[PDB]
Amino acid sequence: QVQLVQSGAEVKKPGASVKVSCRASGYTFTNYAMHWVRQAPGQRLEWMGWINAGNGYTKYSQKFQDRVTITRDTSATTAYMELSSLRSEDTAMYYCARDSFYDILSPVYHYYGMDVWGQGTTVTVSSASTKGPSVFPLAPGTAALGCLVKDYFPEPVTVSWNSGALTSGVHTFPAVLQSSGLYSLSSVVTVPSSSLGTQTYICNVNHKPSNTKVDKKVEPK
Amino acid sequence: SALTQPDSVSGSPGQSITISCTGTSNDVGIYNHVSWYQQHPGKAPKLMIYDVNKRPSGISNRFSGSKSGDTASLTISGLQAEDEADYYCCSYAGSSAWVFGGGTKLTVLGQPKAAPSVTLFPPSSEELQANKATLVCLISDFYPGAVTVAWKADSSPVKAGVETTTPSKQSNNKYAASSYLSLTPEQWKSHRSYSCQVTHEGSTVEKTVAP
Amino acid sequence: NPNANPNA
């Protein structure tokens, strides 16, 4: 079908550069234009610039003119956006969106509209460095136990219980961003109180950015 | 500088609302290249109206657009719960440039509310033996997605060391959040108790832990 | 409704 697929999440230091890609498929690539739009967390959409997929001509936003480069590769039907000298406030979700293109021979009624959008790419700019998590147990009719996944960077962290064999009553919460620049999250499982002495409960925390995996046994206090 | 939209608009099911988008004589007032976009939290925007008043294929006729002078307007008839989203206007600005509006958040009233469930854990002994202490307050199954968290030592408010997440949708149509209080082991053992107080729609749920 | 696409 008609779709735009963007590259994965990026984690960069202040002053670095980042290059996000946007692969098109399902339509004639060189017949359209492609915008790049970004959105800070909780903020509005902001136009960065666009490119004609055919002749490659570009126009950038006056706020980004000095730092953004938008290119395209017709042989791969992919558009690219490079943002240089990154800073903290460049942390945002970045979208690519298709729009109309009219050539010279086009008298036609010119209409526009960002009709197809990519899924978005998160870019995180921070002076923090990669760090594995410290996992602490949260000891408990019904009873609640869990794990605390503290002080890790960057995202993401995956959590399962008993190697995935336990899904009932499990609730894993999105991470908080601490003032230190590190993340912390917690996972909960509600279990029968009758089982606290018989059944073993282990939370499996996986942080692939640091190649660390921790299986923390949570025991009654 | 951007296009001026109202920050929020509210309406009940069946009602009709209108979202304004005020520009200048260099964008909205001159060109018909005016579009409207609907965005649900965490998802990509979706074209709803283009060329001032035209709808793409499949878009319901409940959505309509118009323009008068420098102000474009988006009207949503027969408001439904699924229309709750952020709505953005966008206009051509000349010289091959485009500008977005500030964004408007549309809330649909009359939806059933749900009080939050709260679970509070004290610092683990392993963390205390590492000379650190963290209280974790976990909040789930509330709607709408807006809570305020306040912490208290015994009965005195404490603001230093509090980190709270934004609410996020669960697998059902409820929201979840969490709040963390970082403190030294001496502070934890100093007081008789600590409490996490979650306020939602004027009512509060409080849980307490003690050393 | 002018042509808005960028040029060289």
Side-chain angles (χ1 to χ4, degrees), chain A residues 2-220, chain B, chain C:
Chain A
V2 175
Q3 62 183 14
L4 304 173
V5 185
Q6 306 184 206
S7 42
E10 301 272 359
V11 174
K12 299 290 182 174
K13 301 258 191 174
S17 293
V18 63
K19 192 169 190 173
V20 183
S21 57
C22 176
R23 190 187 76 248
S25 65
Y27 67 95
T28 303
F29 180 72
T30 50
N31 274 3
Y32 298 85
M34 296 165 102
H35 300 263
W36 280 99
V37 176
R38 83 175 192 180
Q39 184 175 37
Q43 299 304 301
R44 68 170 180 89
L45 303 173
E46 188 176 11
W47 185 73
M48 303 184 66
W50 64 334
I51 182 173
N52 303 323
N55 53 43
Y57 296 147
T58 66
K59 183 66 195 304
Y60 306 140
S61 179
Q62 42 273 69
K63 177 213 202 163
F64 303 96
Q65 181 47 44
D66 47 308
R67 300 194 296 129
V68 60
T69 302
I70 305 179
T71 52
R72 58 92 171 81
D73 187 358
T74 296
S75 69
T77 61
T78 305
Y80 307 90
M81 189 275 302
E82 182 173 336
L83 189 58
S84 70
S85 323
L86 291 168
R87 54 186 76 104
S88 161
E89 40 266 81
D90 290 318
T91 298
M93 181 103 58
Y94 290 78
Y95 293 102
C96 63
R98 191 188 73 170
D99 205 331
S100 303
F101 168 77
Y102 299 97
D103 76 282
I104 296 165
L105 293 177
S106 86
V108 287
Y109 183 77
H110 302 75
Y111 63 89
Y112 290 89
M114 307 177 185
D115 56 354
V116 184
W117 292 67
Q119 82 273 22
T121 294
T122 61
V123 174
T124 303
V125 185
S126 153
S127 60
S129 323
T130 303
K131 177 179 178 300
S134 302
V135 180
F136 297 107
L138 302 171
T142 207
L145 60 98
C147 290
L148 169 64
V149 184
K150 186 167 185 53
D151 295 337
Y152 69 88
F153 188 86
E155 291 269 57
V157 153
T158 59
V159 181
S160 63
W161 286 89
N162 287 9
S163 295
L166 185 64
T167 79
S168 325
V170 173
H171 192 349
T172 300
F173 290 73
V176 71
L177 180 51
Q178 310 165 237
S179 63
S180 63
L182 307 179
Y183 294 92
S184 276
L185 61 79
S186 322
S187 179
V188 190
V189 59
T190 314
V191 304
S193 307
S194 98
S195 66
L196 292 180
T198 68
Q199 181 69 67
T200 298
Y201 294 105
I202 293 177
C203 81
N204 322 98
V205 189
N206 190 30
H207 185 239
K208 293 163 152 193
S210 53
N211 287 320
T212 72
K213 177 178 174 58
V214 180
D215 308 317
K216 169 61 63 177
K217 174 163 171 183
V218 188
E219 230 167 352
Chain B
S1 209
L3 310 166
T4 309
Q5 303 183 227
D7 263 38
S8 321
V9 52
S10 52
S12 152
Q15 183 183 315
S16 148
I17 56 86
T18 307
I19 303 174
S20 36
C21 172
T22 306
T24 74
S25 94
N26 288 330
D27 42 83
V28 176
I30 291 301
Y31 313 116
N32 294 336
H33 299 321
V34 179
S35 322
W36 289 92
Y37 300 91
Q38 172 196 77
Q39 181 185 32
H40 286 87
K43 295 191 92 262
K46 177 191 201 174
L47 175 65
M48 307 295 290
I49 292 282
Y50 70 99
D51 195 64
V52 177
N53 55 11
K54 289 163 186 54
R55 293 153 21 222
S57 176
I59 299 303
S60 175
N61 54 10
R62 301 186 297 108
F63 301 85
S64 37
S66 67
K67 204 182 70 172
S68 153
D70 293 314
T71 302
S73 305
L74 174 75
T75 303
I76 302 179
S77 99
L79 203 59
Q80 304 174 7
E82 71 185 288
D83 296 333
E84 265 199 16
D86 297 321
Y87 290 81
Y88 296 91
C89 62
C90 170
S91 175
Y92 186 50
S95 323
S96 284
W98 303 83
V99 285
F100 275 107
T104 305
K105 195 162 312 256
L106 170 61
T107 66
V108 172
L109 316 151
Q111 289 169 324
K113 314 192 321 203
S117 287
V118 181
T119 295
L120 176 62
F121 290 100
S124 74
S125 315
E126 290 95 331
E127 185 181 23
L128 292 169
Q129 287 163 359
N131 307 130
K132 284 172 301 153
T134 303
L135 298 156
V136 47
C137 193
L138 305 152
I139 322 156
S140 56
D141 290 303
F142 59 92
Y143 188 91
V147 292
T148 52
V149 183
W151 292 85
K152 278 179 175 51
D154 292 334
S155 91
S156 322
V158 47
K159 213 33 171 173
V162 173
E163 301 275 10
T164 304
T165 72
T166 62
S168 63
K169 197 183 113 60
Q170 301 174 167
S171 73
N172 55 358
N173 186 45
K174 305 292 186 57
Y175 284 79
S178 60
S179 188
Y180 296 81
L181 176 56
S182 283
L183 70 171
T184 74
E186 309 88 270
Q187 292 176 333
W188 165 243
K189 294 183 102 303
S190 299
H191 302 74
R192 304 145 200 262
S193 86
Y194 277 81
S195 279
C196 170
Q197 304 178 333
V198 176
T199 293
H200 169 81
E201 307 296 309
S203 294
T204 305
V205 180
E206 310 179 26
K207 295 285 257 150
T208 313
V209 290
Chain C
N1 292 78
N3 197 335
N5 293 98
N7 56 38

